[PDB]
Amino acid sequence: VRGFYLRFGEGVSEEANRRALALAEALLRAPPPGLLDAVPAYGVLYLEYDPRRLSRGRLLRLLKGLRVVEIPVRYDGEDLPEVASRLGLSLEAVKALHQKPLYRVYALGFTPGFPFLAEVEPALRLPRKPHPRPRVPAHAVAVAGVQTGIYPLPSPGGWNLLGTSLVAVYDPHRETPFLLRPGDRVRFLEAEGPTPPEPRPLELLPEEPRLPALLVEEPGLMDLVVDGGRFLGGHLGLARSGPLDAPSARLANRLVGNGAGAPLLEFAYKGPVLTALRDLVAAFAGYGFVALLEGEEIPPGQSFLWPRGKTLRFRPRGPGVRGYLAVAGGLEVRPFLGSASPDLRGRIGRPLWAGDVLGLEALRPVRPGRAFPQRPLPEAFRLRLLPGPQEAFRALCSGPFRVARADRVGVELLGPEVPGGEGLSEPTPLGGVQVPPSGRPLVLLADKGSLGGYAKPALVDPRDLWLLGQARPGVEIHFTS
């Protein structure tokens, strides 16, 4: 799975952005099979695709011949006085200036539904903060230089906070989840009223499934049901998601006769405790755990009969941190925008709870006892690097790094100093190695944010991204060309 950019003009340019947005819509309105994402942001359009199904030449030749929204706002931002005095204006002036232009969405989805709007009037243009707040509250309306934005949900931020949107831009429970879409025009107007609530997570599995399969006795650390992933959502800020270690997910399903993206269960560090509500055939793959069905150990990479009333358990036996459980027929799921995978940033899906009842989608007649020798998890990960959209290579390949933090969003590395940078947000590539100006390098994974400001000198080869799905704090990593 390759991915590439088409750039039409540097900086925040209306013409260049119209050009990028135009092509994005042309593809999204009629997506050729093989297109994974088309994400516009200012003068840049990012295209992610499968070369098996869709060639780059095909995709390029397609491109060769390829709404005003009111935002009511209470202007009581914590920075409003500061911004006024810093710019030599009154409160009234900043409020008038901010309401004047008909803005437009140059980029969308720093978090799901988060619009980057421009242009702010010259007199109101003011640089970002030196240090960002770790938590900017939901619905905050802030400005930074030529831009203005709306925080659909809580996140960190150093933009100058001017007020609060009296309408929630993002809400997945709503009939139309995203109030704003790329290219839309926005007018702000001063209003009075309550701050709207944050949406709470949208559940992707039915509470009472039609074919109860297993009861969650005890939950693991974070058990997430996942399918192939969510596609053609990056332009809204929706993550690809899916299994963090795809090869293992596939094996688990493959063994129980399921398709490629049959909803299965991913768990990390601590697995769940599950009791079959009926006779099942399931399979366990992944690393870090050993399965135990009523005492008897079940090694990973083989399917097995799971009788009614018996309890399955997972016991750590490392290294590796992430394991998958697949059941014959797949799990029943209510999909959101085409996928059962979660986006915990966008509050789509949730970790399994105690008392949850998962169900079969279909009654697939399969015989248990299929087995396949899983590729072993190597002691040290020798990850391959590809050229990123941004000298830097040498820094990464020079020596051994060590995994500090590591989750579904990305793997944080500490080791040799690597030169970074920052600019306008652009769509985050597949397996990109993100290097800030001053900060640890961060390899971005399935739950990464759609847009990113920090430089991406390299990409991890997509055939090596599974290793980072089994990354544990302390694991050593070596980069090579």
Q: How many CB atoms lie within 10 A of CB 328?
A: 25
Residue with tokens 């009788």: 307
CA distance 282 to 302: 9
Q: Please state how this structure was obtained.
A: X-ray
Token output for 185: 């025009």
CA distance 21 to 9: 13
**Helix 91-99 / helix 80-87 crossing angle, nearest 10 deg:** 100
* DSSP code of residue 384: E
Of 343, 116, 133, nearest in space to 226 by CA:
343
Give the Å distances, CA to CA, from 357 to 104, 205, 258: 45, 9, 20
* DSSP code of residue 123: G
- Resolution of this model in Å is 2.9
3-state helix, strand, coil in the chain (%, to 5): 15, 35, 50
Contacts of 341 (CB under 8 A, 6+ apart): 226, 227, 228, 229, 230, 241, 242, 349
Rg (CA), the chain: 24
Token output for 43: 């003068």
Alpha helix stretches (DSSP H) within 233-386: 246-255
Token output for 188: 């702000």
Sheet of 224-226, strand order: 224-226, 264-268, 322-327, 280-286, 302-306
Check if the beta carbon of residue 205 is closer than 8 Å to that of residue 333.
yes
CA distance 329 to 333: 12
The DSSP bridge pattern shows strands 68-74 and 185-190 to be parallel
Give the Å distances, CA to CA, from 190 to 167, 186, 271: 12, 13, 50
Token output for 439: 């900060």
CA distance 16 to 22: 10
Q: How many CB atoms lie within 10 A of CB 251?
A: 22
**Helix 56-64 / helix 14-29 crossing angle, nearest 10 deg:** 120
The DSSP bridge pattern shows strands 451-460 and 432-435 to be antiparallel
Q: What are phi and psi of 443, to 5 degrees?
A: -85, 125
CA distance 83 to 74: 16
CA distance 400 to 51: 32
CA distance 90 to 340: 50
Of 425, 373, 481, nearest in space to 149 by CA:
425
Check if the beta carbon of residue 327 is closer than 8 Å to that of residue 264.
yes
Token output for 166: 């009296």
Of 111, 175, 169, 172, nearest in space to 350 by CA:
172
E strand or H helix at 306: strand 302-306
Of 276, 282, 224, 291, nearest in space to 253 by CA:
282
Contacts of 122 (CB under 8 A, 6+ apart): none
- Domains detected in the chain: 1-66 (3.30.1360.40), 67-199 (2.40.100.10), 200-374 (no CATH), 375-481 (2.40.100.10)
Token output for 225: 């049901």
Distance of alpha carbon 424 from the chain centroid: 19
* DSSP code of residue 395: H
CA distance 27 to 89: 45
